[PDB]
Amino acid sequence: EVQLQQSGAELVKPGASVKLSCTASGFNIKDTYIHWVKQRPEQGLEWIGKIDPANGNTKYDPKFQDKATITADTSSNTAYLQLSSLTSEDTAVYYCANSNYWFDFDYWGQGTTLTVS
Amino acid sequence: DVLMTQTPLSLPVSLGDQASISCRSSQSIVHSNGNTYLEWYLQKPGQSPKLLIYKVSNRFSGVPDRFSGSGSGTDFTLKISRVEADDVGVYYCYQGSHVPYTFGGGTKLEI
């Protein structure tokens, strides 16, 4: 139906650039939204942006924009959240939600924990 | 920036009981299409959120009919007619009408 297979936990240092991977399974990634939703322990759920790999189009929450650079390996079906020039706010769990054939989004990733020492 | 909050933040119920989670936005979340696209997602400990309810009162395929939303304007309600141990987790209230899109505060439903 929809399966989103995310990377596991990674443990990094600040001033790095780390691309978190969200592998599509069971779908072509150009017929749907890729959303990234952030969740810090000190936050609820916070929409980052969206990418439609199909024609490159992105829309942003200005707050996290250009701390987050959102890209996609288009043909390999894998979307990527490039979290660049890190601070303490990058220490978070990221969730990757897929557009619903209805009107919103059905099923979420598996969680990619980016811990920043 | 539409702020969606929930009360209570933790809702203790019995097995097979009816839960009612009250959600309220800071601004009307009615879409320009004329429809209200309000979603509820269930996130369990160690898991990612999963869609249960969309368009207020529409049920996602594979979701038990125990789940149903209601309300209108800014004040909405997540109703769960038969809360079991399998329904335990944190529910989020998400609006996809206003950019940037926003989620709810989060209510932990527990037995």
Binding site: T32, Y33, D52, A54, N55, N57, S99, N100, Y101, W102, F103, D104 | N33, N35, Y37, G96
Partner: peptide, 17 residues
Amino acid sequence: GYPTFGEHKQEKDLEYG
């Protein structure tokens, strides 16, 4: 057709025709 330009994703499919 569609009444507007843009990506015609699932959400905005209610506007086809």
